[PDB]
């Protein structure tokens, strides 16, 4: 590494990739106002907040354990031009607080 | 993959890894104002910083990059009790700005 990476480095620094719980978390408040799937859930995160990134592995391992909880469910969509239907998701339920608060977590982890 | 885990995430959160980028201005803000050594950087950074882990790794990346940069010098001091010497690191020169320039990067840092 040169001077000119140190420097650039303060100013531009790599995003924090979610941890497993940020997903399960931010999943959470992105479905309780919207219906998503996958990479859809990837790049809005990054898109709508730079300083973060969210791979495949660990978006899947929140999305099974919202799934063994029955927190989120998800179902099947058409997408005019490709015949592949994508798996999309949902809140599981219209009042839920035990998923309420865990996407409150994310918007505080955000604050400031 | 339980709850429990998601609702211990945010109350013990992970410590971060300093980066070669980070782990040199740290390692030069410490080498302004005192001598010192490897066990201690990282010895001194988590005592007073339990955020933050140096990864004996990334201090030797940065500690040799001082080096070929010739902005830190190393000298052979002996330990009391311990036939084993110990390699003290020190400001190479004088009167240096690199080092200063650095090391207020990483004072500032702690905010951002």
Not at 20 to 29: G, I
Not at 44 to 49: A, F, K, V
């Given at each position: 590494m040169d001077f000119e990476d140190i420097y650039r480095?303060?100013?531009d620094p790599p995003p924090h990739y979610l941890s497993?719980?940020?997903?399960?978390?931010?999943?959470?408040?992105v479905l309780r106002h919207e219906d998503s799937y996958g990479t859809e859930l990837i790049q809005?995160?990054?898109?709508?907040?730079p300083n973060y990134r969210l791979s495949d592995t660990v978006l899947y391992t929140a999305l099974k354990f919202l799934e063994?909880?029955?927190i989120i469910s998800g179902?099947?969509?058409k997408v005019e031009g490709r015949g592949r239907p994508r798996r999309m998701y949902q809140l599981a339920q219209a009042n839920d607080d035990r998923s309420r608060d865990l996407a409150?977590?994310?918007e505080r982890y955000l604050s400031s």
């Open positions: 480095f303060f100013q497993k719980e940020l997903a399960v978390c931010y999943v959470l408040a809005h995160l990054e898109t709508h907040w063994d909880e029955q179902y099947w969509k409150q977590l994310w």
